[PDB]
Structure 1
Amino acid sequence: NLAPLPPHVPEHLVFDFDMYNPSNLSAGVQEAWAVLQESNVPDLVWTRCNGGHWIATRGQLIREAYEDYRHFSSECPFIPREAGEAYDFIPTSMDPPEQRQFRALANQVVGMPVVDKLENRIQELACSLIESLRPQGQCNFTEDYAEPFPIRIFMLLAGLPEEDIPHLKYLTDQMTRPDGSMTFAEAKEALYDYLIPIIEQRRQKPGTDAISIVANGQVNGRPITSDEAKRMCGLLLVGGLDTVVNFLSFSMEFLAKSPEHRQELIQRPERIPAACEELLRRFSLVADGRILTSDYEFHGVQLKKGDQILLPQMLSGLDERENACPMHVDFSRQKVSHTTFGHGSHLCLGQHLARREIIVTLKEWLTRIPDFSIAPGAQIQHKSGIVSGVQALPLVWDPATTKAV
């Protein structure tokens, strides 16, 4: 149920939003979150759900809060409170100045030059998976492409066996969209139980994979400890297994429902980079936040030391103060404004690898299967959380319209 109102929270600012189960969920998850941006609702509200916390609802306030690490700390970034307390991943659980040194090391394994290195295998794998599904006339897109494609690339990058994917994917999902069988703390500890033996193994026998580079790496001179390497590798696992996976499915659900947008990109495959950005704005999917270090008056509201505030990256680009007609997808938008990959000092390091997996998917899929639909009568359901997603996505096409390349 609800959590009792704190003394400092005025009554006219209460709007009971549940981020794990929004009441408008059937209309789509972005639409369900967009109810916070209607005429009746203020820029900053308090919900009594999930222990009780603030939510900033506007792009202006979300950008402002992510720039100010002094008042708004990363130490406790997840809601509910006990998930945020247990959270100790690197570099996401630290503020500047100390987080900055770990960023350069993580950038060695997921940054731009490693993307260039992988580009040939990313190409190879997409074409292979799509050419396999092509004669079939149908697929559950989430199972058949959206999961195997990003995840297999990450397991290659990190040098882990493919047979381990089911176990790891399950644990990751409990951290982002819990079903109640595991607490955040139990999920995290089980991921660490997996990593520790492997990090010890590649510290005595180094390879060229991602885990070997992190474990044998250096932060601003000094050798990195086994503990820090475990906490950095934990984040990379979560990021590689539950981000692009979920976004690909939102993008393809839209494309199956809009043959005009599908056609524009077939006619002009050079607009596909630009299309990628608009889809990232419209189908943004991440929402975490920050904790108040002191009492602070933020835009005429009293925040108290210890309060959690959810600062949904998702909402910035759906805000009509930033983009006009925000629920409409337009590939020739003049300025595409979002904070899909974050804002401030914690800007997503894997964003280059993300965009390449997205752009290669669009180009290579439309090139082979230009005409497809949602399976008729099937109702598409979303799920909300720290990272939102899609439960299933049955597609159908007719194999005579396809092209073997």
Structure 2
Amino acid sequence: HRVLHLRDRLDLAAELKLLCERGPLVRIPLEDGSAVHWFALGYDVVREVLGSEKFDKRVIGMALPGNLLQLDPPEHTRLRRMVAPAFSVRRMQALEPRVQAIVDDHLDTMASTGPPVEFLREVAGPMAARVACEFLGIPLDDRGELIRLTYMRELAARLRRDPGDGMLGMVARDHGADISDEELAGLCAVVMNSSVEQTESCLAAGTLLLLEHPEQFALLRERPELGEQAVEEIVRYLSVFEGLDPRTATEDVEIGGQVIKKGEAVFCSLLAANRADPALDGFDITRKESRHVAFGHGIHHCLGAPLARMELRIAFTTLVSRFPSLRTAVPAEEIRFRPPSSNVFTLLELPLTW
């Protein structure tokens, strides 16, 4: 369903805009009669689908342990409840100064190398990866290699036998016998993946978005208290996680005024839900409350959202303050974005100068 990923730079492609005009829930019977699929395109219907207990995440026509996105209740609940305490408000507050210092480290490297910089590979990527290591509690001597590769079972088993700090230590200390080596390794892999894919892309493309709106780049500098609002507006506008794994109805269920039959698959487009409403779509960090589903909704709602929200706030606020003269080293119109795919949305490189 490639149409759900068609963009014009950061905005929706006309072809996808045209599709959204067909209403927030669109029935898509396959041309071969093999199935009936649905596109959930509106904010309310996407929330209705994702909150419903009447859908599962069955495979339809690689499964890895510790991957919450491939579990349904009650197994999903069992694993999620064991890892959830790593993201409490208490734990992000304890972690904030150390994340601030990691961000400052990478912006120190940037200011010393001097311009230009390829911001994606040289700043955003490493920053996101290093924050992930700190959150996870990766031992210092493993971080360089772990990041270079993005082994995991060997790493997870060793840390499990001697709990450290961070999320992995907490999990092994409090649930050592209830989580296997492969499941702990799977958690580690998802966190690294979500950091070097989703978070890195938000950092790089969000910097571009701010640079394309220099009034707001500067506003965040003069009013850093806007950081939290800025993050919500950035993740809404970017929608780097564009479309979700299908939800299959386990029984007939009425959604958005239509009957989704047992066995039919619903594809939620976060991109469309976040962007298709022309009314209030303009990028504006002074919006006090953003209407978006950039982190999903329901039992699979992004487990890392507290970390992502804190890391992005720290990164963007510090960046605009330390580099008021930042600008793209090429015209914004020349930036390459990855072509339509179910993979995370990202630009391919971001040359910056200052």
Aligned to 1:341: 295
CA offsets 1:246-273 (integer angstroms, 9 cap, x no match): 1111211111222111122223222222
The CA distance in 2 between the partners of 1:240 and 1:233, in whole Å, is 11
Identity, % of aligned pairs? Answer: 24
* Shift in Å, 1:227: 4.6
Structure 2 residue 117 is matched with structure 1 residue 139: yes
- Cα pair distance change 1:336/1:34, threshold 3 Å: farther
Aligned to 1:316: 273
What TM-score comes out, normalization by structure 2 length?
0.83
> Which SS does the other structure have where 2:251 is aligned?
coil
The CA distance in 2 between the partners of 1:297 and 1:118, in whole Å, is 43
Verify the 8 A CA contact 1:69 1:95 in the aligned structure 2. Answer: no
Structure 1 stretches of 5 or more lacking a match?
1-15, 170-193, 398-405
Verify the 8 A CA contact 1:316 1:339 in the aligned structure 2. Answer: yes
Aligned to 1:104: 81
Residues 314-393 of structure 1 aligned to structure 2 (within 5 Å): 314-320=271-277, 324-326=279-281, 328-377=282-331, 379-383=334-338, 384-393=341-350
Q: Residue 31 of structure 1 aligns to which amino acid in structure 2?
A: L
Residues 1-400 of structure 1 aligned to structure 2 (within 5 Å): 17-19=2-4, 22=5, 24-25=6-7, 27-32=8-13, 34-35=16-17, 38-40=20-22, 43-46=25-28, 53-70=37-54, 72-76=55-59, 81=60, 86=63, 89-134=66-111, 136-158=114-136, 159=138, 160-167=142-149, 169=150, 194-218=151-175, 223-286=178-241, 287-289=243-245, 290-296=247-253, 298-299=255-256, 301=258, 303-320=260-277, 324-326=279-281, 328-377=282-331, 379-383=334-338, 384-397=341-354
* Shift in Å, 1:217: 3.7
Verify the 8 A CA contact 1:216 1:224 in the aligned structure 2. Answer: no
Verify the 8 A CA contact 1:34 1:318 in the aligned structure 2. Answer: no
Q: Residue 114 of structure 1 aligns to which amino acid in structure 2?
A: R
Moved more, 92-101 or 282-291: 92-101
CA offsets 1:264-321 (integer angstroms, 9 cap, x no match): 222322222222221122122212131232344544656444433211233322242x
CA RMSD of aligned residues (A): 3.0
The CA distance in 2 between the partners of 1:386 and 1:55, in whole Å, is 18
> Which SS does the other structure have where 2:330 is aligned?
coil
Q: Count how many residue pairs are aligned between Structure 1 and Structure 2.
A: 340
Moved more, 59-68 or 254-263: 254-263
What TM-score comes out, normalization by structure 1 length?
0.74
- Cα pair distance change 1:92/1:263, threshold 3 Å: same
- Cα pair distance change 1:42/1:266, threshold 3 Å: closer
- Cα pair distance change 1:223/1:87, threshold 3 Å: closer
